[PDB]
Symmetry: D2
Subunit: 114 residues, 4 copies
């Protein structure tokens, strides 16, 4: 099943934050309406924030997260959770190797802001 | 129902990260085994990452999040999600006022690390 | 925070199913646009399905679950989960007593159908 | 990533419930410790409960859901969500074709019971 793709309300600002837990350098791309809107890279085995940004979901609301390590696409897991019918999380884990911890890059998207 | 209380794996490192989306200055307290282990604070209406820290869940694994604004406790919502039976997120929203956006302080706990 | 309230896409069919795990008879009311659209009741300590039905979310998409036992509303917990950006679950637990297992009536709403 | 595999607490009763939304007849097999413990089959495009049963997670706590149509395995998605640190839902969707609604068989596992 496709993972790392989310439909947000149109024209809405959202936060995106990435963490690293891996020997490999993680590259996280965030695409809005199929175009790159943010890119974070970094290396940590201690959950360091490797980037945070606020983006607008645009006319389509389509947001996609991709993760790669030295060009090799990571396998992704994802889901969206909504609390009290108001607060949205779109969550992504990724695996760059064999241990299947799926934390090598972790991406959190949250909305609404403000 | 009680919110913002999570049972983590014992003796295990986790990340805790807080975001602010409010006019009021937020204070987030993270308790491990009923003792304050981290405090974050800030003021942003644009998702500032007011704190992020790696903690150990200790012998009992009990982790609790509390949020206050100028000394008044905020109302909390929370849940835990698990992806691919391995990757864990404990999620907290909080409301300091009347609009019920529940994003005034947002806290994400993630494990495992490394 | 309010619990058991969900915004579905407008005019969309959804499933609603309730289970019982308690000594007392559970009455589950499902409201669409703030009117009772279905009512289920039954008693089980073994997760019996006490009702299942297909409903339409109507013009507003507003769906609410309420649970009553022994003449009093139960305390509710809830969340919505979306898998692969397609499959939606709106989940409700409820507590009628003192043990805080929150399973006394469990309600599952799922969409889309077909 | 692997989907449809959950680790439950050992020796614990849980509910498993399957729904169908597809032209193809769905077959759902629920494995406990790698042996089939329940099986449900049926065709519906209206969310029929093609089966619901109480099982015991046994010594291993390993529960796996498989879905097929006339022997052809469906693609699975899944996640687990925990409410108020107490109430567990393990969720499965499945896709037997090309439209990616992932609702062709939907399986919900809930615990604890009683
Ligand atoms: C050496 O192990 C670490 O690094 C690899 C490669 O980045 C990760 O897959 C793994 O989960 C660990 O974080
Ligand atoms: C002025 O409104 C903003 O600030 C208040 C007080 O902090 C929040 O409750 C609200 O959601 C907005 O973020
Ligand atoms: C005809 O379309 C229906 O049946 C196919 C095959 O079962 C499903 O994949 C699809 O989602 C619809 O439910
Ligand atoms: C048999 C018992 O019945 C009620 O007291 C419930 O609140 C308990 O959770 C338990 O199910
Ligand atoms: Ca890894
Ligand atoms: Ca890792
Ligand atoms: Ca607010
Ligand atoms: Ca706010
Ligand atoms: Ca109870
Ligand atoms: Ca009960
Ligand atoms: Ca399908
Ligand atoms: Ca279908």
């Amino acid at each position: 099943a496709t993972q790392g793709v989310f439909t947000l309300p149109a024209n809405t600002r959202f936060g995106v934050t990435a963490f690293a837990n891996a020997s490999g350098t993680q590259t996280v791309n965030v695409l809005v309406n199929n175009e790159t809107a943010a890119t974070f890279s970094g290396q940590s085995t201690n959950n360091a924030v490797i980037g945070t940004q606020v983006l607008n979901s645009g006319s389509s609301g389509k947001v996609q997260v991709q993760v790669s390590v030295n060009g090799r696409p990571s396998d992704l897991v994802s889901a969206q959770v909504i609390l009290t019918n108001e607060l949205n999380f779109a969550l992504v884990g990724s695996e760059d190797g064999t241990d299947n911890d799926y934390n090598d890059a972790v991406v959190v998207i949250n909305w609404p802001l403000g």
